[PDB]
Ligand binder design. Structure first.
Ligand SMILES: *Cc1cc(CN2CCN(c3nc(Nc4cc(C5CC5)[nH]n4)cc(C(=O)NCC#C)n3)CC2)ccc1O
Ligand SMILES: [Cl-]
Ligand SMILES: [Cl-]
Ligand SMILES: [Cl-]
Length: 254
């Protein structure tokens, strides 16, 4: 139903192998957004076409202030097009490169927003979201926007043991991701980073990680609770949102 004619096109916010993201403007409303233009030659060269169609169908039906909104989508002879909510302050990945580490307050707020968008995704029957720093955009007021949309070394770094060991994964994966994020926000590096993929797998599968001196005991307690080998041993989202160090350092309500 949407057409490229309906949009004024701006500078590239990001170039990729699968395609481009443009600053754009719906000509009618002058509303400003982001156009993810994808080349189906590369939706062919890889096997993502079906996963892509799915993701669009799920994300369209999602509406949360901490989830990047997919407004709509269209296609053409050569390309796919994705009408996305524009988040003007960049990815959390960039920000972490800027600041090196985050304070307790910023970190707890990000964790609060994530836990809320992840409990909503759970209720909406979405059990997983990648939530890696490069998939987390920042809105006008610095608010987090989960943007699990696009795929364009630390591939292993955020994955829980049930995955890397080739097993079965439930909702509890999102708890492990939180612990990894919470660690990285505070320390500037994911807890299991290593020079080789094998060493990273070794630390993940044996939950082997340590804290630099400055990470306060509430922070250690939450991270430790989250980074459990057994999935069922990981707390539910509501215990994270109601956790002492969260409640004590978060500025955004639950
Ligand atoms: C899927 C994909 C991803 C990239 C990686 N770049 C994406 C664009 N980008 C960037 N994006 C925004 N704002 C934004 C992105 C989106 C969702 C992608 C649609 N909605 N709003 C802001 C900034 C930025 O630099 N901000 C200020 C600072 C610092 N950057 C960089 C990452 C590339 C290509 C594809 O296809
Ligand atoms: Cl499917
Ligand atoms: Cl798997
Ligand atoms: Cl060893």
């Amino acid at each position: 139903q949407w057409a490229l004619e309906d949009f004024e096109i701006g500078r590239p916010l990001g170039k990729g192998k699968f395609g481009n993201v443009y600053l754009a403007r719906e000509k009618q409303s002058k509303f400003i957004l982001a156009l993810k233009v994808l080349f189906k030659a590369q939706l062919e060269k890889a096997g993502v076409e079906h996963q892509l169609r799915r993701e669009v169908e799920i994300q369209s039906h999602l509406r949360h202030p901490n989830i990047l909104r997919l407004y709509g989508y269209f296609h053409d002879a050569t390309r796919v097009y994705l009408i996305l909510e524009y988040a003007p302050l960049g990815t959390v990945y960039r920000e972490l490169q800027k600041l090196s580490k985050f304070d307790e307050q910023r970190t707890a707020t990000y964790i609060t927003e994530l836990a809320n968008a992840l409990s909503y995704c759970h209720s909406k029957r979405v059990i997983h979201r990648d939530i890696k720093p490069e998939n987390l955009l920042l809105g006008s007021a610095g608010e987090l926007k989960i943007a699990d949309f696009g795929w364009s070394a630390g591939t292993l770094d955020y994955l829980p043991p049930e995955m890397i060991e080739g097993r079965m994964h439930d909702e509890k994966v999102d708890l492990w991701s939180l612990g990894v994020l919470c660690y990285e926000f505070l320390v500037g590096k994911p807890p299991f980073e290593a020079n080789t993929y094998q060493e990273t797998y070794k630390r993940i599968s044996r939950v082997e990680f340590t804290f630099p001196d400055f990470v306060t005991e509430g922070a250690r307690d939450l991270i430790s609770r989250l980074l459990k080998h057994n999935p069922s041993q990981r707390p539910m989202l509501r215990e994270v949102l109601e956790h002492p160090w969260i409640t004590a350092n978060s500025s955004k309500p639950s």
